[model samples]
Target chain A: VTVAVPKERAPGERRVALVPEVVARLVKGGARVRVERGAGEGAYHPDEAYQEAGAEVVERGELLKGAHLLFTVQPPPEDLIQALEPGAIVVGFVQPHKNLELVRALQAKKATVIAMELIPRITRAQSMDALSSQATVAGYLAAIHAARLSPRFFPMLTTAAGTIRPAKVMVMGVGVAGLMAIATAKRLGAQVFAYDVRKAALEQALSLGAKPIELPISAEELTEEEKRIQHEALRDHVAGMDVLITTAQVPGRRAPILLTEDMVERLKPGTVVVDLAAESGGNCVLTKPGEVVEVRGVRVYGPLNLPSELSVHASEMYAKNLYNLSSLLIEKGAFAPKWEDEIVRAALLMKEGEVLHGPTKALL
Target chain B: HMVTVAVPKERAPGERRVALVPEVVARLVKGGARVRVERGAGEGAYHPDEAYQEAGAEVVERGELLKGAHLLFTVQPPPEDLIQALEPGAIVVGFVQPHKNLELVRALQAKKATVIAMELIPRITRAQSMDALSSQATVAGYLAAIHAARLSPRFFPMLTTAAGTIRPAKVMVMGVGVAGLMAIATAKRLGAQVFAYDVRKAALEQALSLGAKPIELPISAEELTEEEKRIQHEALRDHVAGMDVLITTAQVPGRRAPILLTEDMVERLKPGTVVVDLAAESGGNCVLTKPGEVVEVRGVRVYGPLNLPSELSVHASEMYAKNLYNLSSLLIEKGAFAPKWEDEIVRAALLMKEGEVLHGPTKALL
Candidate 1:
């Protein structure tokens, strides 16, 4: 069985589908792994290294034509998708929720596509969760960027000069990404706080050593009795923070607005705000995708795709996640997926000129 | 009998540490020392003129400060005209190297001014509070680590995540002074494996206490003079070859820093190794060092920072101001000037007073 791993075509995309270490493991299973030339350049993995790991390194076109399975980090263009041989399986972050056109084109090509994002958020599927792995990288990078951008020291320092106070950081949204961000900042010696609308999320943040704060519900969403007690107290939570990191996002929707512009106004000068959900509309209204705006002396950073910045580690984690996902099909010596397996039933997308998955088929 | 201390704006390039901060000004006033500040002395340090006025300093012109004050506190030597403007027997306190500034010492003596060279403050337990050189060195040392972290091509700390472990960076510091100690301390805080190399036993002791191993060298304390600097270069070459970063802090202000990292040694370092020279002002200890410039030599980045303490101006100013305050308050008690009647700190720091130059070995130079 031939498996081809191609370089990502998206702008500023550095992560590769597979690394040399994982490619070696895949080769041990009797699969012929063909990697595109310079596929791992952006992530610092040279082509000679992959060749030494027992993968056949060749030109992209040759690798694509010889593959039974094509792996990617981002969706290929229509031309590249149409070039895939019939019955070839493709897996990556196929955002089937937003890209109906791309989904239809893949179906017309009669290729089996598995969406990494659709890897169900179940206890059993945790090992194969590419979304969580990428988020972990993004969350860690956000804190590093914040620390580098801050004008003051992250830790409290006492010298003959006197005692310097530690920096205060607040992370909004206590999801996996937010928790990782809080932990990284706390490790840097910053006094950290966190907020999320859900009680479980907030409790998770607290267990990770960050002080938990509550998100403000909108005035329109509040009941008449609840409206009597204003949500204005949450505004002051942004008051003394030196850094604010936002990670709230929903699938195929504008990011939840946890921190409004009015709240941003109350923050101290020299404060930095990094919004990870800038690709979708930001959780902080001040966030502009790929832009840094100085709002009354406070820097608001809306950086998209922070995972790609740490692509070295990001690619490694991605390769591990891909191995777990691909393990469901490649058994023994040939392409074999047990139809009875729930993961196989849910992940398989289009084949035989028709969308196989129920959710993807509904989109057609 | 009363003492009025004048704070002058430092004329040195890239110098941001003000001699007097508002916090120090308030304390000196409480100690019965009156103060006059030049119009915008504290501006470079982020403390405005209004802040000094609020602390009860009489903000005045440079001419007024020179003529009216009983003593002048400064970081560097003043221009000849400022000294000429001073009334004879006026006092000036600053980091004046007696050997280096023979002319300035003579000028101060010509004006019959009592000049206290803060550099002459002995490294004793009693003088620690008033050590301006050490205080500024501490500031520079902290900045060295901060700058190293920011400039490193890799991460300083070891990170263990689901992905993998990033190896901690290996750093070696040569010349273990106050700045070198701080550099090691700051690097340790950031989780780096630190190493130190120097001739002094106390220097190696300080490094071990701060969690750094001493870089092995086959030289004795006999290797300690300007005459012996060249012969010692080969001994330190191996110690610096493998370091992720190397910082040299051995500097003689008006003279050349001792050659620690030779030209052949720099070429032996692996690619991506960064060398920060703290001795940038007076010819860095590294062979490739240039004052006020960062150059790349044989794939190694050599950064020459002329005034690192000034980059973190807020804390640097505070440390320097407290140093000046402690010394000024010690000598000027309720306006009574106590000169020629004290222990070594007051005695050695005196460059000139009553027309006698305390020139020591440099007495023939004047």
Candidate 2:
């Protein structure tokens, strides 16, 4: 069976579908893996390493010609998808709603597509969760970016000059990314404060050594004055933070606004805000995708694809997740998937010229 | 006479540091000193004009601030134009690299400006509170670690994710001065396996105390022969090659920084390894370093930050201002600009007075 891995074509996309370790694993399982030339170069994995992993490193066209399975980090361009032989299996992040035309092209090619994002968030599928793996990289990188962008020291320093107070860091959204950011900032000696709408996520943040932002009395249970007081208190706490990291995101929807323009404008001078969900309408009003903007002396970094910034580890994690999922999909040296399997059923986005995923079908 | 102390905005390109921050300004004001700051003097350090005004320092234009100033505080030596505006017998305190600033010293002498060089602050226990070099080096060290983390493709700390257990990055600091020690501490804080190397055994002990694994060579405390020195150098290179991030902060004043990491050594390093040369302004400790640029040598990125302290201006300025404040307390007596000649910090820092070069070393140069 021919399994192909192609270079990521998206602009600023650095992660590769497979790493040397994963390639070696697949090769040992009696699969003929063909990787496009320099497929892993962006992630610092050389063609020689892939060859050493027992994969045939070939040109893009040659690698894709009549491939049984094609793996990618992002959806390959329409032209590349059109070039694929009919009945080929494709697996990767397909951003189905945004890339409907690409999905249609896959449908026309009669390729069976498995969307990584569609993987069921189940206990058994935790090992194959690409979203969580990539989000971990995003969170770690967000804290590093915030620390680098801030004019103050992240940690408290007791020197002969005097004691330098540690910078206060606030992480808005206690998702995987926010939790990672909080952990990293805390590790760097910052006093971390985490905010999340879900009380459970806030508890998770606390277990990870972050102080939860307590907004007592929900809006439904509070009087109008209490609501105003809670809002003002949250705003003031956000303003006092030396570094603010926002990572709230909902799949297929614009990210929720956690910090307003007025709140950002009131931030202490030299405070830094890193919006990890910049690609999908930022959680901060001032964020401009892939650019750092200064509002009233506070720098806001709306970094797009922070995972790519830490590509080496990001690629490794993504490759491992893909490998675990691949183990479930491939059987007996051939493209095989049990349609009844929960993961396979959930992840199968399109097959036989039809979209199998409901949200993607509705979009089409 | 009540002294009029003036702090002007730093005019040098890429200089974000202010001579004094508002925190130090308020203390001077409390001491009956009339402090005037140039408008936007602390702008780059994130201290606004309102902060200075609130600290009881008059925020005025440069010309107005310097016209009748009795003492001038600057991060760099005042330019010829601004020096000319100084009232006769006005005292100047700054990092005046005297050996290279002879022309500026001559101009200051012509202006009858008594200069005190912060560089001349003796490294004694009593002068530690007023040690701007150590304070700024503390910033440089911390920045070196953070910059390494930012530029590195790998994570500084280890994490046991579902995929696997990632190992922490290996960080090596080649000099154990204030900057090197701080680099070791900061890297350790970030969960890196920090290795510190210094020629002096005492410095290595300090590095070990800071939780860094001190790299030791098989050599006696006494001076080594050429053959032994060569072997020690080779040993150092091997350790450097294995490091994911190498920070070199070795420097000798008035001389080019020692070349600790050579081009061949850098090329031997793994691709994606980062080398930050803290002594780039004094000619880098790494041969591949280009001052003020991040150059790549055989897939390894070498950053030569010309002014690392300027990158963290907020804290750098605060520490420097506190240094100046402590020094001012020693010199300012009863609201007058007076210096105790017997005080070593005051004596060594004195560069010139009333058209005479008071520093013996500077006098020899003249």
Candidate 3:
């Protein structure tokens, strides 16, 4: 089957869905790979490299018209969607939960859209665990981001001149991202502390050498019905932290703001608060969502599209993930939409000209 | 007389987690250590009085718990009232930050109680389980990465999902100990290209083992001494640039932390980078780091975290409880508490003696 890898048209986008190295792998897997000229150039993957990988370099019009399967790094732009041949399959990161416009656009063209972000959290999908991989990178980078801006060192040292003690880091939340943050900070020699509403996270945090900051409030007797209520009840603990990082987000919902203005003000001066939930309105009272602000001598950084900051590996991983998803959907060089495949069933945002995913349907 | 080991509830408010659970109590019983627990001592740890009793501990009054106990296992320092009740010459093991609590140490010494500060456990291989700092720091280090990722706006891995080449995060690790090593390995596994620096040249190999590049500076020991402080400062300033996240873990036992990154050096970093200070409670390695605050220097975020390991109480307490149990066994002999000053383990861990200040360095501090 012929696969058309098109250049991404998203604004400020520099990453291509498939780098030359990955395209070569697809070729080895017996699929004919074609690329739109300059598709990989923006990401520093030159067109010549695609040719070197035995891919046919073609113009956008010809690339879209001649291929049965289309691979994109993002949802196709409005114009690109209009130009796709009938009954073509497309795979990439389509925000099915938040982008109804894109969902409708894909349906209008009778295109099969597979969203990589919706991949289920399961054991068999381990290598295809794009969210975990990306979250891990985000966690690691968050420490670096904090450290570079932080005015202190992370580890302690002693010399004839004097002694240098490490900084103390306190983390909020105990998700995958929060766990990674604790690990990264500890490596940098920082005395790290962490807190989470979930009791299960306490052991997870300890194994990583982070001091688990427990709330005096007892959350142990929380029944299953009260779990959500107890999670909301733990907001006061978020205020006592020095460097507060909030990562709690309900699926398809605005992020919970655990840090209020009072809490932000209570933080000691020179403290740095990072709101990873900034894209969804942030966890801090004074956060600008997508901008960094200084409140009462404390710095609050609200960053968006964090994974996009690490483009090379993000692209490489996305490409491989897309290839895996494609393998399930495409059979015998043609679009084979098997509704029974769990990966396809979970990731397919739009099928048979309808939005079937619960999250996507909600957006609609 | 049968020796009793008292377990008191932690006084630090909001501390629902207990240091010792019932499972560990059973082990201590097997080692011949009689456990005396204050009412609801293990409640937060999900171990009820019945459970502790099942594990061979006797539930008793707060005052009675300390009446005849030879050893005390506390999560924090025993309150003044509790300390007053302790039998003379009893052994107390807990996070006694002796320097900060000189008065408390004096009180304990007056009572002739042998105080062993769990926080002071050395980082040697032989003392691995007893190393509360390492056990707790390991949890803190791992959690730091997770917290940072959750608060970050961007994703960690490079993605072609939308259309651009994202740069790999540039992480700078300041310490190269157990906590630092765990952080390095965790970050590398998550696809971050990591860089680390340490004062000890010995840490270089350990840093490299976890897939992090060690930043080396050209300076002799003499140059470190001969150069004006400004010149020495400039060398460190140059190293601070180009880092996306800076995690500082440098610390000296019982001393204010030296400045690793000055305010001027922090200004050179790109906006949106994060600086995590793990030593804020001890006077951070950054001039701008305030304990438990997010400081901004030219738009960069500086985080001074405090008591990170407390965030992971369950496992940390479990690990520490085991250590305390082992330490108790080491000090206990034939159903009675015995102080073996001749034994190096006991000598190194002892902090008070015969109504006099002992433990050389701490006494000097007092």
Candidate 4:
């Protein structure tokens, strides 16, 4: 089967759907890889490299006409959607939950659209995980940005001249990115403290050498569903922190504002607060997504497109993950679906022109 | 006779917290250090003039505050203006980066001011109260985890819900220093599977004590020089591939950081792996790390943070203030300043006295 890798047409996006390195891997899996002449040029991947990687260089229309699978960084354009073969599979970040019209269009075409954006969070599917990988990068970038905006240093230094002590860092949620932030701060010789609603995080926090500022709140009997909805009371705990990073948010819901304006007022002057949930409406009460505002001597930063800050690696990892996902759907020279495979079943949004997942059905 | 201790307002524009708070002033007054506050000096420290007066400290003009003062407490080095106004033989205690500000030290010496750097306080059992490094590191470690969590997208702990199972985060900490150890403890508390690596085998117990699994590498040399030990330490990068978040804290005193992660190793890491290079300002453990920038290599992000402890300035200042108090208590008795040359802790921290640079290390560096 021929896979047509096209240039990303999404507004404000410069990343290509697939790069040469990933295309080489796809070709090795017995799939013929074709790239639109200048598809990867934006992300620094040239046509010469694609040719060297064994992918056929072709025009967009010619590539699209002959290919059995359409690989994209984003959903295909409306006009190009009708041009795809009846049973051809189109894979990329389809955004089915927000783009209902696009989902309907794909259904009308009888095309199998695998949305990379909808990869469910599960243990076995972690290797094929793209969102977790990108989120980690976002978290690391956020810490560095916060530190750069800070007016001081990160580590303690005792020199012949005098000693400059390290900065103190505080993280609000203990997740993939939060853990990375803790690791980063510690490496820079900053004192790190972290807190989370989940009682299980206590061990993890202690293991990283950061003081787990445990709130005296009980969540022992609370079900997972309830824990996701209920905001833990963190009044006294929030005031002592130097840097406050809020990453707590319920999926598909607005991020809960864990830090109130009153709490921000109590922070030390020159303190920096980064809200990673800014794209999802922020976890700080006074946060303006994608802007830096100083309130009560505290700097509050809410950057929306943090992952894009590192475009090169973000594009590379994303392309590789997409290729891996595509390989599961297409084996040898035909469309192969192991319906019983957990990854296939979990990622299957729509099959045979029917909405198979609750998330996609909600949008319907 | 009461020993006079003058508290000056910090000249660094962004500095807010005063060296001594009202509570500290009361304690000093109880200890017979007749405290004098420059007017409005305690405002940023959250202590009003009235509060200092209530604590029995006299609020005086900058001139009167320094005229009879035998000792001074400051956050940064005293300005040239303040130094010029000071009486001869007056002792000043603050963070004066000795190497970076050698000219400042020489100038202070020329004026007959005995400068005692609070940062020079030795780390020993006898000097535990005076250990500003430990006190500040505790605060920095706590804050680092808090910042990391704010940037994370998912929850820290694993959970079984009707929606799905949320796996725990995987955390790796590099350099088993005080801050690194604290980060391991913090990440572990947050429900992460934490791992730590360090160059010195002595740090293994501390890493294990914090509940982090230590990544051990075979040592090539039995008796290792400090430089050789550091070079051998970069072997910890072998464990970087699978980590979701890597925090590096490796540093050799008075030298650049040893490179811990190469670009190739960074590329092999999972796309979302976060690498925080704590040694950024002195050069980073990650090759791609630029101080204060989050550079992405392959799929991993290299975070080089500057001034992480400043995030928790109040506590840091408080801890530093306590260390100053401890050192002062050791140096002052009755109404006069007493120098104990025999005391190792005192001799190690003392810089210049009676027309000579006294501290051994400072003299050696000079």
Candidate 5:
């Protein structure tokens, strides 16, 4: 079986679908792997590395044509999809709910699609969780970016200039991303405070050395006047913060706004806000995805696809996930995904021009 | 008589720090000094005009602020234009790189100004509070660690994820000075396994106290034979190779910064390694460093940072303002600009008095 790995065409995408380590594994398993030239340049991986890994490094035109399977980090561009072989197996982050155009084009080519996001959250499938791995990178990036953007130092230092107190970092949302963000901020010696509606997630955050912030009352149960009053009271908690990282995101849904325009305006000058959920509608009203908006003296950065900033580690984890998934998809050196396997069944969003995933089909 | 102290906005490109903050201005006001800040002078440092007003400072235009000013305070060298507008024999105090700022010295002499160079501040027990150089270096050191983390592709701290166990990045800091110690402390705070290098044995011990593994070079370079030098060089290459981030802060006061990381040593590092040279403005310690630019050689990113303290303007300005306040207190007595010539700090800080250069090193250079 021949597998094709095309260089990602999306702007600001630095990660490659398969790293040289994973390529060597596939090559050892009797699978022929062909990669586009300069596929790993951004990730500091040269084409010669792929060549030494027993994979054919070729031009983009031939890399995508007549392959049994195609691996990609982003949705393939129109020209790349046009070169897709008939009945080829396609795997990667398809974002099938919103990327309707890419989905329709892939279906037209009669491709068997497995969306990385649709991979079921099961104990057995934990190794193949690309979303979790990528989220880990994004969360780490959020904390690093917050520190770099803040005018104040994250850690306290007793110096001749006087004692510089540690900055207060508040992480909004305690999922995998928020937990990682908290850990990174704490490691940098910032006093970290975490908040989440999910009690279990907050417990996880506390285990990672973050102080939990429990709101006095749920705004959901309050009257409009009460909610406004609660928001005003909450401003004190946020105003004192030096760095705020918001990572609240719901899968396949718009990210809920946690920081309103009024809250940002009230923040002290030199305060930094990093919204990791900017791609899925930001948690801050002032955030413009991929742009830094300076409101008064406060800086609000809404970064898109932060994992690409650390492509080397991001690709390493992503490639390992792909390798694990490919191990299950390929049997006896042939392209044969276990049709009844729970992971395969859950991830199979399209089967030869037909949408099998209910939510995805409903969106179409 | 009330003293007229003028604080103007810094005009140098990329300079964001202001000389005085509102808190310092309030103290000056209480001391019976009339402080006048040029409009928008403190904006870059997050000290707005209204804050200065609240502290009893008059926010005037630059043209008006310079006129009738008895004392001029600045972070960078005062511009030639501002110096020309000064009253004759005005007291000017700020950073004056004596050797490089000869043109500024000449302009100050034309006005017969009493020029005090902050860079010339004597490093004594009593003058520690007025040491702006050490204060700024402290900021640069903290910033170096943050810059390294931002550029690095790997996590500084080790993590055990469901995917695998990742190791913490290894960081090596060359030169264990004030900035080096801060860098070592900041890097350790981020959970990196830090290795510090310096020529002095005492600095190496300080690095160890800060939880960093010290790379000690036992003998001085002059004491080593040619063969011994090559062996030491080989050992240095091995250490550089193991580092994920190598930060160099070695700078000679009046000379070009010593070359600590050569081109071949940089080549020995891994492709993803990042090198931050904090002495870039004084001809960097890294052979390939270009001031204010990120140079890529063999897939390694070499950054030559300039004015790193300016990146953290708010804190940097606050510290600088406090330093200036402490220094001014020594020169100003009884609400008047009167210098005690016998005072050691005042004597050392005075670069030019009237139309003559009082600093011996600066006078010899002229």
Candidate 6:
């Protein structure tokens, strides 16, 4: 079976779904890989690198011919969808629920599709988890940008002149991205605190050597009881923190509000808040999506495209996930997928005549 | 009789350093010393007047601060007219460079006052705490590296991201002095391959342990003295070509800094080079360096930094205040009337006392 990677069609998208390293990996595994010319240019992967990696660097016209499988960072565009062979499999980060029209278009064309969003969160499928891999990059980049934007030093230093106070950092939501933010800030010699909705997080945060604070919930719209409990919550610590990073998400739904306007009012001057969930409606009420806004001298940066900025590493990690997922669907040089396979079963969003994924199936 | 210290605001243009910050003021007050500061003196150092007031300094106007105090700790010497404002027995301690200010010393002595020039303090281990030049140099050097890093287009460290490996930026520091050494160390910590040279003719070349000065001549700067012009210059073609950033600190005491990077050499070099001149305050060491603006010549970015130490005034003010307190820490012994020239430090620093113009050159001039 011939696998092909095309130039990503989304605007401002610099990441390539399949880098040369992973192209070489798939080629060595007895599969013929064809990449479009200049497919990896945005990510700084020159054509010479792809040619040296044992892959056939071809044109888009040549790549479409005899292409059994196609890889991408986003869903295939309408032109590519119409051009696809009926039996060809289109695999990548297909947000099935959000791309209802694209899913219907694929089903009408009788083309098979894979949604990275549906890839099961199991131990064995972790390497093929594109969501987690990209989250790792977003988390690290957020910390770096925060440090650069801050007027003060991130670390504490004692000179004969005077002592510099250590920057107090707080990472909220306690997911894969939040944990990494906590780790990076701590490594930079900050006073780190990790807050999660999951109890005091002693088992997770303390193991990472971070101080744990409890994430407050609305106990009583979103209540007099709430104001009292919120006042008693992480409000004081949130106000005192010099740097805060929030990465709370609810998969497909809107990211729930964690930092309300009440909490923002209490924050000190020169504080920075980096909201990584800006695309999913953000975890903070003050977060202006895709912009950095100031509230009472506190800077709130809700960056929607952090992964795009770190194109090199983002593409590399993403390509690894693509190859790992692709290996599971192909067998014996034929268009055969094991329906009984857990990762393959969960990730296949559309097959031939119908949209097969549950969340997207409900939408249709 | 208790000796009170009066700290006046710095009058020099663009000088933000205050002689006595609240940190050292509180320290002196705890030691039974009274301090009177002219109001708003510590404002440039991010110290509010309330901080000094709480630290036991009687915050007052300039005239009242001078009239009420017996001893003054200052960063810059007062003007000639302001010297007459001081009472006859008043003692002033600051960076009064005795060698350069011979005329000012004679005028202060005519008022029966004593001036302990802090610059004349011997650099022995015993007087290490009183070294103001070294303390101020540390601030300037650290800021020079930070300013360069902030302005650079590329990252300093070599990072192998998933895309590809990025090479580290090459940093070149000219002149091996206190400021240059600190700049080199800071750039090194930021993961740049730093190269440094000492262009001072027959000086200690103190920064490097192994050096007899580059003898093989090729091309050098044109700002040298006639005697220095006779010496051979090094061919810096290979070195200048490799550097991504350059910080030039070559300077003469009263005159301008010697030129290190001329226009021809910079034009022959690669694009995207950043040069920070630390000696911009005393006429820069580069032909392209502009005093307070970014000068772009043939794709190279040359920035001439002025008063680089004042950029980080929080600590700088603290260090200056600490150094100033030590000067009067011993000199204020046995009250204002009884003078004890205890050791070599006091003997070397004093310009006048008891209506005598005592300094070697000042006495000859008087």
The CA lDDT at A309 in model 2 is: 78
CAPRI verdict (incorrect, acceptable, medium, high) for model 1:
incorrect
lDDT of 5 by residue, A1-364 (tens): 8999989888889999999988998988888899999999878888889999999899987887648888889878787888887778788999966578888888777778888998899999998999999999999989989988988778776666567788899999888888889989998889999878778888898898998876767412559986776677667788889889999988889999889877887788888999998989999998999999887888999999788888888998999888889877797778877879999899988888788988877777
lDDT of each: 0.77, 0.86, 0.70, 0.70, 0.86, 0.72
lDDT of 6 by residue, B1-366 (tens): 767778888776877778888878887788777888888887666577888999988899877768876777777676576577787677777877544565666667777777777666777776766777777776677667766765555455564432234566778778767777667656665666677666453322444333212322343422557655434332565567667888888777546677777765677655557889988877888888889888877667789987765655655676667776666556665434234476788787776676676666557656
* Interface RMSD, model 2, angstroms: 1.0
Model 4: residues with Cα > 4 Å off, grouped in runs: A1-277, A280-285, A306-364, B8-26, B30-68, B137-180, B183-200, B211-306, B332-342, B360-366
Query: What total of clashing residue pairs does each candidate reach?
Result: 2, 0, 132, 82, 0, 0
State the DockQ, from 0 to 1, for candidate 6.
Answer: 0.09
DockQ-best of 3 and 5: 5
DockQ of each: 0.17, 0.76, 0.04, 0.07, 0.70, 0.09
lDDT pick, better of 3 and 5 = 5
Task: Indicate which candidate wins on DockQ.
Answer: 2
Interface RMSD in angstroms for candidate 4: 10.0
The superposed Cα distance between candidate 3 and the true structure at residue B206, in angstroms, equals: 1.3
* Ranking according to TM-score, highest score first: 2, 5, 1, 6, 4, 3
TM-score of 4: 0.62
Candidate 5 or 4, higher DockQ: 5
> Alpha carbon lDDT of residue A298, candidate 3?
69
Q: Model 2: clashing residue pairs?
A: none
What is each candidate's fraction of native interface contacts (fnat)?
0.07, 0.74, 0.01, 0.00, 0.71, 0.04
Report the lDDT of model 2 for residue A285.
Answer: 91
